[PDB]
């Protein structure tokens, strides 16, 4: 039987702000993330980890015209065009919800697990991720008889893809064929689209990923996000809705043709249950500020569920009130769990943004690189690694420091050994 | 003694329309282009050629999720999503003015000729060109002691680059250090930008290419295109202005701060002469429909110049009238030459769009692959090749034909032998 395994992103050393804060705490950011990972693991929810990337990323600076040695390039950019430093030093890869789109073997035509890297074309600093993200996935899901990793879609606005963050999977047990729901923000020919915040996900992209992941045509549904919610701050579906098994926890203003979509899911998903949060109870604004929907909806063995939320949801009387009501109402959600993720939330990432859901059978679980599976040993090893290399204070100005560069290179080289990934980074090649 | 050599694009076999004409004539399109090439060569203007690309381009269709053999992929796309066929079968590479940005050795810090491939990120069908365009340039400008080809900038809207079409070079003799003028349509932070037709060229990209091409900082000027002209159809600078030696032939509504730009050129370029066409005489509309500014401004040995224009300029009484006046006025232009380029103009390409200007010293000219330099032998060989493989009629519907695919592959394989390029195309690797 298959279980849903969460793969979380280990915050990188250059985590920074580019709130009125300019000083970040990389070390604390990583520790907060590790704590969430460990807690869930300890509670019985399969957990794994995905490492940070090479930052600053000098290769793209060379692509931009700066030549010399890594340190000279860094110096030239610092002196001539320092704004690029921030753009090539983001710890954004930590939000693995955007790393790729997953298709469990129960939904594929060739019976293998498929993962398609997201190009993340809309944002320059995130578009840099794809190549390295592909290497990491291939080093983690290395067994080609069980896993199939596809390269990201062409890097153009027409095929903007933000991955799992806009993906959903509904059904009975995880191991059974499920219904996949792809949410997009825009499509060619459709005049209905955001007018203040461009849509990062296009239907053309979603459909291509569906194709690449060999998804059964009858087990896929494409739905357009409500354009008005996007203009309010919902840049990904995972900020206004989340799914798990037969449940779809969403805001009433989440989808363009919501009524139609839900009815369709009810007809196609056995026992499907939609939990819509009316705007009266919680507004879109409240949703965006608390990240109520960027929560993880987990399943226990008895069929009950747990909601993992960021601290902002508890600090908001209105949302907390709603959650306690939901807890007592007639539905699977029987527990609420809150985590302090201030560092990630400062840059726009909640509990779900930091994780990538991968349903794996018992045999597939065994095929995954064991060095990335969470347990006491990995937890302690990572914590020590963080205490050794991560700084407690960082600003954009420190990105020009050659020593930060050197520290990050050693750190990643040591981590690649710890996670048994080999020479997975560009600088190692 | 350096000369400016024109490298024209040989129209590909899939030239088609995706006016209301639906039937294209690939063969005629190629022959019209060859005729212009030959005429200029015969008149004494150094001329060379750049081959078409692999079309349909199946590899991108696979990236989009269609698997199987080349024929099956083609079949699946034709049946499932036929609109992709057109987007991967464009003969757009013919407009080599967008292939890359050139820096003559007289302007470079390392004394070599630099060529940076344009990403052409704005349009999906043209963004496919970069990789193959890079291989072709490296096979034509193969001597690395004389030429340096740099890969295209990252494929993101922030770094949209359309190449030479937005470039200009002013100065005395071609071989002397010249003043480079980079024209862009938008830049970050600048609220001044097109509002109807997105700007394909960003200042950030222009500046990066300037760096890649090792351009002397004092020999470069960045100027913003007038946003109002862009919204009227001027998607590239070579549709509203053209330079040559000490002359800059442009429309009065060409640049944002025109007065300041021209005064600056007057101060930095000896003998600089700006020929501004007032709106009263020729409107922007007239400009866009006739392609008056997408003309080639050539130099003869005595210092006189010749304007190479598309038929549309002669057919427009107003523009033709202005040209005759310009010919008699006090300036270097002493001759007008018109060519029939209806096929290319049908898709938005005039004489200049079909050519890439490369200033080369005598030694550099000798270093260029001799097999692509224009002469009677190459001219006759190419015309025969065209007659053998090009169809007289074509529509988007024919792009699904496996036989057209096979014809194009053999044609390109034979052409690669004729032009002594080796296995330069993906299908040959
Ligand atoms: K409940
Ligand atoms: K004249």
Curated annotation (Swiss-Prot), chains A, B:
Its function? Catalyzes the hydrolysis of N(2)-succinylarginine into N(2)-succinylornithine, ammonia and CO(2).
> According to its UniProt record, which reaction does this protein catalyse?
N(2)-succinyl-L-arginine + 2 H2O + 2 H(+) = N(2)-succinyl-L-ornithine + 2 NH4(+) + CO2
GO molecular function terms here? Answer: N-succinylarginine dihydrolase activity; protein homodimerization activity
Q: Name one GO biological process term.
A: arginine catabolic process to glutamate
The annotated active site, in chain numbering, is 162, 236, 353 (nucleophile)
Tell whether Signal is among the UniProt keywords.
no
Gene3D superfamilies cross-referenced by the UniProt entry: Succinylarginine dihydrolase
> Where is substrate bound in this sequence?
98, 125-126, 200, 238, 347
Task: Give the pathway annotation.
Answer: Amino-acid degradation; L-arginine degradation via AST pathway; L-glutamate and succinate from L-arginine: step 2/5
What EC number(s) is this enzyme filed under? Answer: 3.5.3.23
Q: Please provide the record's keywords in A-Z order.
A: Arginine metabolism, Hydrolase, Stress response
Q: What name does UniProt use for this protein?
A: N-succinylarginine dihydrolase
Q: What induces it?
A: By nitrogen starvation, and arginine. Induced at stationary phase via sigma S.
* Family membership noted in the UniProt record: Belongs to the succinylarginine dihydrolase family.
Which SUPFAM superfamilies does this entry report, sorted A to Z?
Answer: Pentein (SSF55909)
- Pfam families recorded: AstB (PF04996)
| Subunit relationships | Homodimer.
